[PDB]
Scaffold this active site. Structure first.
Site, short mmCIF file in Angstrom:
data_model
loop_
_atom_site.label_atom_id
_atom_site.label_comp_id
_atom_site.label_asym_id
_atom_site.label_seq_id
_atom_site.Cartn_x
_atom_site.Cartn_y
_atom_site.Cartn_z
N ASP B 55 1.24 13.02 5.65
CA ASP B 55 1.37 11.92 4.70
C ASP B 55 2.79 11.38 4.72
OD1 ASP B 55 0.23 10.30 2.50
OD2 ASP B 55 1.71 11.36 1.27
N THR B 88 1.13 4.81 2.51
CA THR B 88 2.40 5.50 2.39
C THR B 88 2.77 6.06 3.74
OG1 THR B 88 1.88 6.14 0.10
CG2 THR B 88 3.69 7.30 1.20
N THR B 89 2.04 5.65 4.77
CA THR B 89 2.65 5.55 6.10
C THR B 89 2.75 4.10 6.56
OG1 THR B 89 1.41 7.60 6.48
CG2 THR B 89 2.68 6.72 8.32
N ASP B 392 -4.97 12.12 -1.98
CA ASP B 392 -4.94 10.75 -1.49
C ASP B 392 -6.34 10.17 -1.40
OD1 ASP B 392 -2.30 11.38 -1.32
OD2 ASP B 392 -2.10 11.04 0.84
#
Ligand SMILES: Nc1ncnc2c1ncn2[C@@H]1O[C@H](COP(=O)(O)OP(=O)(O)O)[C@@H](O)[C@H]1O
Ligand SMILES: Nc1ncnc2c1ncn2[C@@H]1O[C@H](COP(=O)(O)OP(=O)(O)O)[C@@H](O)[C@H]1O
Ligand SMILES: Nc1ncnc2c1ncn2[C@@H]1O[C@H](COP(=O)(O)OP(=O)(O)O)[C@@H](O)[C@H]1O
Ligand SMILES: [Mg+2]
Lengths: 527, 537, 526
Positions: B55, B88-89, B392
């Site tokens: 992540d 969130t990448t 997530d």
């Protein structure tokens, strides 16, 4: 508190290590030689990548040939040096295929680790590899389809030399094939011994590779010290003595006893040097090339009788000049030359690439010696083309020794993988596992050609066995574009060094066998 | 003459080139962990702790940075967890490529304020185009939208199986915690799902506990560890001996009155424990402390008492079982009443075996029917990865059920915005059209990274990707090519409508708003002054 | 933490691999291109590099700046060698070859980070380079009316642009007229050793001159040089390679004498040996004596009494230029002196230029050489003036053998982007992203003509791409006015082989950087 394990039976070393067994000695020699096989796997093939290797002398070597990379890498593993010296023997024997040794013997030791960890020891993997090696030398005369026999001229060798050029110079495969055709055929000894030392490379820094050419003669990097640089007759008197007079050997001492001998000594020495230069001017000489130094009195009469002087400080370049113009180096001072004179066509000077050179250019009698004048933007590029030039001269010596050729580009290694597998299934013994692993080492050699081209090697290696159904024996690899749909090698013209394939299989088999014989390693303290 | 500061000053294009290499130092790390062909990393500490994760938030939080332009991209990943939760990448690669293409503009002597104003015209138009080119809300697809959006988030992690085992457990967890609010707000608080870890069997044995899974022990080994038809008594006060406060002291003048005060410290203590136990309560949860004297009254009466539970876990049990969190005595000057009608309810409170530990489970809670997920992995490194991948995945189905709008994933949004913004830059573009044109090339790095990590064709698959999206905008013949994405397992453009590759709308709307705003702050570091560290004076 | 063997790999060597290696090589060439980036165009500044010894060298040539940076990067040494070969082949392609080769890597830098195995980039770079060097030869103008005044005007316009971007602002019409007149006095060899460039400290740039003969620096003499006046109307020069000293010994002579009557005969013979050599120089008209070997006090006073001038310890590079100036020959033995070996000039004086004395020769019509005396205010000022003079000489040296010229500035580099973008739209495949990227990389030569002085370089490239696609093909960047201008009509000329060898060396350097995938460095550095 905490105890420790001391020495047991033979711990008598003063800082040296020891290896015994299969896991500490045999399995570690395999994994060390596997790292050299994975190193040069990227630089193998026509789509190989270069490697900027810096040695201990802090200079730069960028090349894709596996022979010159291992000479700069300071390898310290002992079993890894055996695969380096086996590749160095390929350069001394045929001059091409040094990288073929690192892929094949690197895959022979890697597949031997799968046999020692599942089964037979080194007493049967070695004996299993030797049976398949003798059978591999029986298929190679059967895979010969073409020969370098008909029309030995500049037209046929311009296509037969493209395989050694395109493996290291892919874009310049057409220009370097014609430059190696006008140089190797022009020095032919009329069915004799082909000397590879009769082709020199004069690196001239300047424009690109399109301005390179081959001059029938020799090109030096020195000056004249005169004003007779325009020579058209070119009657060359080659000497090895220093062109400054005849001095004695033991001590040397002028002994003056009266005033007449002091005044006449300076004038008598100038008249003695005047008679020696005019003795070679009456014979018709125009170029006087010496090996040693030249005094000021010799330069005075060289410009007076209108003869050109050439200084050659290297003693090896003086012997090549005698085979260029057809003369003989005279060790004594200047005689009347009877029949050992040189005969060139035009000896002149020109500043090419901000470098004043001396050219012994032959015009009419073209074939005595050849020199390929290479041009490049960097000095590192001209060293890489010189390695590709020397691979073209060494391939011409292979065709002189043996005119047979085998279809390369992956077509030979698949047929060697099919016939050895046929011998492995007909062997009712326990050594048939090493014969089947010997054929899989030939399978990994076109695998390195597809991985360097950005193609998936699983679909590439599946189409090779599908088209080799007992009668084709010629389809290799088409690395020109993705989704290959591979074609025939004889129609494309990719075939080179049958004698190179004969020695690279024999050297890599004996290198992988010698590693497997090592069961106990006793090294010393490095200092 | 010059500035007499004791630090360091660097002006010009030195810092303008250093901030791009500071942003590219972070983007080149997380580029290998994007998409279904992404791979995890290893985070080894100096003390020896190993953290295996992929992540974009867990990697950049534990990684130490020094450059001031590097702390902007690291804090940009921390904001994506709170706002969205899986996004969130992709924000870090876009915000670094927004600075890489703007660096090529300011080297052409283009002023950066035109690039900042040019990025705002392209960011507001990207939100305008994505809100008018959505496929459908959550009425047509139904439950197939929630499962397919969950599998897209798990494809980049360790739980990306070909089946629908982990996908069905996430949808059944969010749908069981539907908490209504005022003015018609069906909220889905995903933080109420207790995600537990235990090194046990494989990932196919992950239990979906309908209820709550308390991570505590019973304590005394004389209590019944399984109570059927249990009544949970949620309370927060330490069940220890009655200790007087600082203002109260015991000053005795008579030796005969000594032993009656000493017995009074346990009689007042046991008076509370008999009025909370005579009302039928069998399970007692306490955030304080129950000492060894008070544990006898639960063994004698046959009740379960759990001590030292978390305060965040007691609120999730009392709200789901109808219990009232009581701290003391109350109800209008009453001595001991306890309001016995406000006890919790539970079908079964059973302590099972969780591979050499004790874990308390509550079944269906009889009031709200909450859910808790117990994860099962090989080692502790997989259990920390399975917890981050499940959290997530819970944030994806939360935003779909709240905001009923989904966009096609796999580079389908970035392909349509790469061609619409090029036509948008030609209409109203005079001097800021070069910044809008580089905004489209910066958005193309998301389908470009999917082709690199899959080891497929790079300059041909994305060129075939935008070939379908160009015909969907210039040829109005109802081609329906707005959902063309990437098949990374085959290497060909596929239709993400039928393939089930769905992403929420605000995983790309908030990603394009946070990456454009972060690219403005790093674009204004033309002058930078670094002072010396003041440590030893 | 991964590699821990009992026997290591080689010794301790580190080696990068793959895609992080290639971007490490491209970004390294961008840093070394900044040292030649501000030196392009007439509004380009120079740079000053100081070594560890304290020697300052201020220059703007690419072959001078890059050799003093001491770059130890392996990929960045490729851009230094193409700046050395441009000085060795052309002489004025230096800063343009290094900066254009860095743009060939920066335009494919977003392409090498996303796939694109580099054999497609090498094949596309060699295809675009061969089409670029062919369109130059098909558009380079030439004349068929040479050996006239029009050919000399073509050589002057190529030397004014070669003297541009140097430390010369208003002396373009004065210096470049002397550069064309320097190479026309030479023979048909065009040797750079046949022209002396000597720096005399003191004086402005207008005080420089081109001597038709030669001039040496008047080295260390002896007692007798305040005599021998420097007024000669038709002298003869005796070029010698002999010692005029009394102590001329062969270093092996032992004169054993037996009596005192023969002892005085040896000492009288040693003076008679030296005086017989001076009688050979005398009675021949050779009033000027030149020798590379020293002359003692005896032969200096002999020429002062006979009203003859001499000069000893002359360097061998100056006597070779003196031989081609006067048309004589250097005679080591003085016994063969005649009228065919002596020189002849008209004006031979010893002036006082810059404080130091200089013996200059002038008046000889059969002068196959020349000498360009530079006068400046600093030692580093005259070294830059000498370095700027070598760039103008080597341009006009190559312009005689090849008079095909092209337009200067960014006129050729913009129209080659037109012919390559039109070629890229006619071929399918991945070459549209590489031939077109090769065309966009050629547009930095008009960018550095503008970025060094502002000029709004974004708007001036929209005028260049519109003018080349509509009308003429020689429109470039004007330096005085902030607009586009026809460089062929503004006499901004350069030879065609300057840009041919620039595109060839920059493409072969860019093909070498993208072809290396591993870099192994051994730690033994002693
Ligand atoms: N045109 C081509 N098509 C396909 N394969 C080729 C072509 N040219 C060369 N090759 C392959 O490239 C390889 C180069 O091997 P090389 O490194 O030269 O071996 P060595 O190191 O022994 O000289 C050959 O094995 C050959 O099969
Ligand atoms: N089946 C699939 N096909 C194509 N692309 C996919 C698929 N599943 C996931 N992806 C892509 O992988 C990317 C993963 O992004 P991710 O790293 O999860 O973002 P964040 O770090 O914000 O959570 C998504 O942008 C999505 O487009
Ligand atoms: N009068 C002028 N107007 C516009 N541009 C000019 C003028 N004179 C020179 N230039 C430009 O200045 C540049 C100088 O390049 P230069 O540094 O000499 O290259 P190199 O280093 O190869 O000698 C040329 O490319 C030319 O286009
Ligand atoms: Mg080869």
């Amino acid at each position: 508190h905490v105890p420790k394990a001391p020495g047991f039976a033979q711990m008598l070393k003063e800082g040296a290590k020891h290896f015994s067994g299969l896991e500490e000695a045999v399995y570690r020699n395999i994994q060390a030689c596997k790292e050299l096989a994975q190193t040069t796997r990227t630089a193998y093939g026509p789509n190989g990548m270069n490697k900027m290797v810096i040695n201990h002398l802090e200079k730069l070597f960028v090349t894709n040939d596996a022979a010159t990379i291992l000479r700069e890498l300071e390898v310290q593993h002992p079993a890894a040096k055996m695969i380096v010296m086996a590749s160095h023997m390929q350069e001394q024997e045929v001059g091409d295929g040094t990288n073929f040794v690192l892929v094949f013997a690197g895959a022979l030791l890697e597949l031997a680790e799968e046999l020692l960890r599942i089964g037979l020891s080194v007493s049967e993997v070695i004996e299993g590899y030797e049976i398949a090696c003798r059978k591999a030398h029986e298929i190679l005369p059967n895979l010969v389809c073409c020969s370098a026999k008909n029309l030995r001229d500049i037209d046929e060798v311009s296509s037969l030399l493209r395989t050694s050029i395109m493996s290291k110079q892919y874009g310049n495969e057409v220009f370097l094939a014609k430059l190696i055709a006008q140089a190797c055929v022009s020095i032919f000894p009329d069915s004799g011994h082909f000397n590879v030392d009769n082709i020199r490379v004069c690196k001239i820094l300047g424009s690109g590779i399109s301005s390179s050419s081959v001059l029938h003669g020799m090109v030096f990097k020195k000056e004249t010290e005169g004003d007779v640089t325009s020579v058209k007759d070119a009657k060359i008197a080659v000497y090895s003595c220093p062109f400054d007079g005849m001095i004695t050997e033991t001590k040397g001492t002028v002994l003056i006893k009266t005033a007449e001998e002091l005044m006449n000594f300076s004038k008598g020495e100038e008249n003695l040097m005047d008679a020696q230069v005019k003795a070679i001017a009456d014979t018709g000489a125009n170029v006087v090339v010496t090996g040693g130094k030249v005094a000021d009195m010799a330069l005075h009469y060289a410009n007076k009788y209108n003869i050109m002087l050439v200084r050659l400080n290297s003693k090896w370049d003086l012997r090549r000049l005698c085979k260029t113009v057809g003369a003989t180096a005279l060790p004594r001072l200047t005689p009347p030359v009877l029949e050992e004179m040189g005969h060139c066509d035009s000896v002149y000077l020109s500043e090419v690439g901000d470098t004043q050179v001396v050219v012994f250019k032959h015009e009419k009698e073209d074939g005595a010696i050849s020199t390929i004048v290479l041009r490049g933007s960097t000095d590192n590029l001209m060293d890489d083309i010189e390695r590709a030039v020397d691979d073209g001269v060494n391939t011409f010596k292979v065709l002189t020794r043996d005119k047979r050729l085998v279809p390369g580009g992956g077509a030979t290694e698949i047929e060697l993988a099919k016939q050895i597998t046929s011998y492995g299934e007909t062997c009712p013994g326990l050594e048939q596992y090493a014969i089947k692993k010997f054929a899989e080492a030939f399978e990994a050699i076109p695998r390195a050609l597809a991985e360097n081209s950005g193609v998936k090697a699983n679909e590439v290696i599946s189409k090779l066995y599908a088209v080799h159904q007992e009668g084709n024996k010629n389809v290799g690899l088409d690395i020109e574009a993705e989704v290959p749909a591979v074609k025939d090698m004889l129609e494309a013209g990719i075939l080179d060094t049958y004698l190179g394939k004969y020695w690279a299989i024999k050297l890599a088999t004996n290198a992988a066998v010698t590693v497997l014989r090592v069961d106990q390693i006793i090294m010393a303290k490095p200092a | 003459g010059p500035l007499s500061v004791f630090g360091d000053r660097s002006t010009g294009e030195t810092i303008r080139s250093q901030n791009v290499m500071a942003a590219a130092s972070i983007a080149n790390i997380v580029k290998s962990s994007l998409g279904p062909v992404g791979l995890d990393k290893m985070l080894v500490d100096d003390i020896g702790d190993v953290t295996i994760t992929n992540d974009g938030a867990t990697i950049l939080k534990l990684l130490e940075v020094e450059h001031p332009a590097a702390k902007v991209l690291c804090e940009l990943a921390d904001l994506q967890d709170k706002e969205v939760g899986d996004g969130t990448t992709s924000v870090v690669i876009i915000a670094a490529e927004l600075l890489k293409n703007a660096d090529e503009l300011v080297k052409q002597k283009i002023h950066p304020t035109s690039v900042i104003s040019g990025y705002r015209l392209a960011c507001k138009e990207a939100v305008r185009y994505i809100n008018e080119n959505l496929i459908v809300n959550t009425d047509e697809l139904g439950r197939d939208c929630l499962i397919n959006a969950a599998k897209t988030s798990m494809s980049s992690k360790i739980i990306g199986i070909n089946g629908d085992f982990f996908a069905n457990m996430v949808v059944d967890a969010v749908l069981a915690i539907k908490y209504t609010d005022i003015r018609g707000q069906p909220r889905y608080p995903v933080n109420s799902v207790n995600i537990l870890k235990a090194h046990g069997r494989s990932q196919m044995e992950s239990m979906l506990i309908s209820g709550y899974a308390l991570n505590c022990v019973v304590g005394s080994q004389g209590m019944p560890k399984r109570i059927v038809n249990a009544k949970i008594a949620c309370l927060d006060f330490s069940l220890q001996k009655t200790k007087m406060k600082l203002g109260v002291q015991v000053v005795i003048t008579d030796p005969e009155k000594l032993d009656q005060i000493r017995q009074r410290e346990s009689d007042i203590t046991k008076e509370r424990i008999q009025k909370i136990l005579a009302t039928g309560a069998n399970v007692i949860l306490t955030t304080g402390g129950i000492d060894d004297m008070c544990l006898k009254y639960f063994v004698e009466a046959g009740a379960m008492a759990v001590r030292r539970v978390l305060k965040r876990d007691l609120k999730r049990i009392a709200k789901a079982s109808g219990a009232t969190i009581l701290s003391t005595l109350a109800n209008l000057e009453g001595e001991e009443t306890f309001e016995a009608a406000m006890l919790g309810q539970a079908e079964e409170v059973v302590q099972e075996r969780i591979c050499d530990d004790e874990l308390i489970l509550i079944k269906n809670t009889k009031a709200r029917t909450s859910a808790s997920i117990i994860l099962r992995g090989a080692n502790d490194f997989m259990c920390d990865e399975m917890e981050r991948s499940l959290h997530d995945a819970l944030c994806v189905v939360k935003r779909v059920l709240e905001s009923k709008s989904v966009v096609p994933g796999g580079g389908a949004v970035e392909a349509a915005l790469s061609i619409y913004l090029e036509n948008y830059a030609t209409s109203m573009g005079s001097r800021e059209q070069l910044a809008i044109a580089e905004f489209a090339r910066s958005l193309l790095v998301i389908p470009n990274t999917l082709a690199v990590n899959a080891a497929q064709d790079s300059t041909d698959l994305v060129a075939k990707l935008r070939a379908f999206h160009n015909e969907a905008q210039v040829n109005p013949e109802r081609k329906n090519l707005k959902w063309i994405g990437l098949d990374l397992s085959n290497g060909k453009p596929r239709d993400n409508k039928q393939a089930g590759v769905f992403e929420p709308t605000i995983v790309k709307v908030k990603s394009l708003k946070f990456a454009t705003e972060a690219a403005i702050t790093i674009l204004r570091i033309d002058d930078l002054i670094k002072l010396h560290p003041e440590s030893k004076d | 933490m991964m590699p821990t063997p009992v026997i290591l790999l080689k010794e301790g060597t580190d080696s990068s691999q793959g895609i992080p290696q290639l971007v490490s090589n491209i970004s390294a060439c961008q840093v070394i291109a900044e040292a030649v980036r501000t030196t392009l165009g007439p509004r380009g500044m120079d740079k000053l590099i100081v070594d560890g010894r304290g020697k300052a060298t201020i220059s703007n040539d690419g072959a001078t700046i890059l050799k003093l940076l001491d770059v130890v990067h392996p990929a960045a040494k490729t851009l230094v060698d193409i700046a050395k070969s441009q000085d060795a082949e052309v002489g004025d392609g230096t800063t343009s070859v290094t900066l254009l080769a860095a743009e060939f890597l920066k335009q494919v830098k977003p392409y090498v980070e996303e796939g694109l195995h580099p054999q497609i980039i090498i094949r596309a770079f060699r295809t675009a380079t061969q089409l670029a060097v062919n369109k130059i030869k098909e558009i380079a103008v030439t004349v068929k009316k040479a050996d006239k005044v029009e050919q000399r005007k073509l050589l002057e316009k190529c030397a004014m642009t070669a003297l541009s971007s140097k430390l010369i602002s208003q002396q373009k019409a004065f210096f470049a007229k002397m550069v064309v007149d320097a190479v026309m006095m030479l023979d048909d060899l065009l040797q750079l050793k046949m022209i002396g460039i000597k720096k005399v400290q003191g004086g402005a740039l207008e005080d420089s001159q081109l001597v038709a003969g030669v001039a040496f620096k008047k080295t260390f003499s002896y007692a007798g040089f305040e005599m021998q006046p420097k007024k000669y109307h038709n002298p003869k020069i005796a070029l010698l390679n002999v010692e005029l000293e009394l102590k001329a010994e062969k270093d092996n002579a032992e004169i054993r004498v037996h009596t005192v009557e023969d002892y005085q005969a040896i000492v009288d013979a040693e003076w008679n040996i030296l005086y017989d050599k001076l009688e050979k120089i005398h009675h021949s008209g050779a009033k000027v004596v030149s020798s590379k070997l020293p002359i003692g006090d005896v032969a200096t006073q002999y020429f002062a009494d006979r009203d003859m001038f001499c000069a000893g310890r002359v360097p061998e590079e100056d006597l070779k230029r003196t031989m081609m100036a006067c048309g004589g020959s250097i005679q080591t033995s003085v016994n063969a002196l005649s009228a065919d070996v002596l020189g002849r000039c008209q004006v031979f004086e010893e002036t006082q230029i810059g404080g130091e004395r200089y013996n200059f020769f002038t008046g000889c019509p059969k002068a196959k050489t020349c000498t360009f005396i530079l006068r400046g205010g600093a030692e580093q000022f005259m070294e830059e003036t000498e370095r700027s003079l070598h760039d103008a000489i080597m341009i006009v040296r190559r312009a005689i053998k090849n008079d095909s010229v092209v337009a200067g500035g960014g006129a050729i580099e913009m129209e080659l982007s037109k012919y390559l973008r039109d070629y890229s739209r006619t071929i399918p495949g991945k070459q549209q992203l590489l031939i077109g990227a090769y065309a966009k990389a050629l547009e930095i030569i008009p960018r550095q003509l503008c970025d060094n002085a502002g000029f709004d370089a974004t708007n001036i490239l929209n005028k260049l791409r519109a003018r080349h696609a509509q009308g003429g093909t020689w429109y470039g960047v004007d330096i005085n006015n902030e607009d586009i201008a026809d460089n062929f009509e503004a006499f901004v000329w350069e030879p065609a082989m300057v840009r041919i060898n620039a595109l060839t060396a920059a493409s072969e350097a860019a093909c070498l950087i993208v072809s290396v995938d591993e870099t192994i460095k051994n730690p033994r550095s002693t």
